[PDB]
């Protein structure tokens, strides 16, 4: 099991898209990068202030008030 050790899902080829299909093994069908399927929620995300140049994403941070800038990475 590789996709367990890396921290992804095992969704089928019909459910997840053709691009999210990782090359790792151990699943029942195909591995799917849940970190990169959704957005800020995919790994958990972070609001930081408008003073700090980072990333912008209207999906979640749009009502953060103080620091309406959603940032997320692979880690």
Method: NMR
Q: Within 13 Å of residue 67, how many CA atoms lie on the same side as its CB? A: 11
Type and span of the H or E element at 3:
helix 3-6
Out of 3.40.50.2300, 3.30.1680.50, 3.40.50.300, 3.40.50.2020, which CATH number does the structure's domain 1-38 have?
Answer: 3.30.1680.50
Q: How many CB atoms lie within 10 A of CB 4?
A: 12
Buried b (16+ CB within 10 A) or exposed e, 52-63: eeeeeeeebbee
Q: Do domains 1-38 and 39-75 have the same CATH topology?
A: no
Q: 18: closest CA among 30, 7, 6, 10? A: 30
**What φ, ψ does residue 48 adopt, rounded to 5°?**
-130, 160
SS3 category, 65: coil
What are the structure tokens assigned to 54, written together? Answer: 């980072």
> In the chain, what are the domain boundaries?
1-38, 39-75
39-75 folds as Anthopleurin-A (2.20.20)
For residue 70, the cross-strand partners are 47
């Amino acid at each position: 099991n590789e996709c367990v050790s890396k921290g992804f899902g095992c969704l089928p080829q019909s459910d997840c898209p053709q691009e999210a299909r990782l090359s790792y093994g151990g699943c029942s069908t195909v591995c799917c990068d849940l970190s990169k399927l959704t957005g800020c929620k995919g790994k958990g995300g972070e609001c930081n202030p408008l003073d700090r140049q980072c990333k912008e994403l209207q999906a979640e941070s749009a009502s953060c008030g103080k620091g309406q800038k959603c940032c997320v990475w692979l880690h």
